[PDB]
Each structure stands twice: as structure tokens, then as C-alpha cells.
Amino acid sequence: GLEHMADEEKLPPGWEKRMERSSGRVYYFNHITNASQWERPSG
Numbered sequence: 001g002l003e004h005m006a007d008e009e010k011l012p013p014g015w016e017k018r019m020e021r022s023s024g025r026v027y028y029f030n031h032i033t034n035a036s037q038w039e040r041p042s043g
Helices: none
Strands: 015-019 026-030 035-037
Touching: none
Parallel strands: none
Antiparallel strands: 015 026, 026 035
8 A cells, every 4th residue: 555556467368477486576477377577567
């Protein structure tokens, strides 16, 4: 809460914005192809 609503918050279809439990680092994960990236993806 108390943030902005950039397009960074509404990931494309198949992608999900999650955080790593190991270091606590936010990233994106594509459940369609079991991929992931840090840069904003595009469906």
C-alpha cells in the first residue's frame, strides 16, 4: 500500500511478480513456460 499504479504492478498474461525466499528479491516468473526475469516482460 501507499505506492503508485505503474504497469510494473500488472504483469502480462502468464507472468507473475514474486519475491525470492532465499534473498528477498522481487522478480517476474512466467508459469506458461516456467521462465523468469527481472526486467518488465511483455505478453
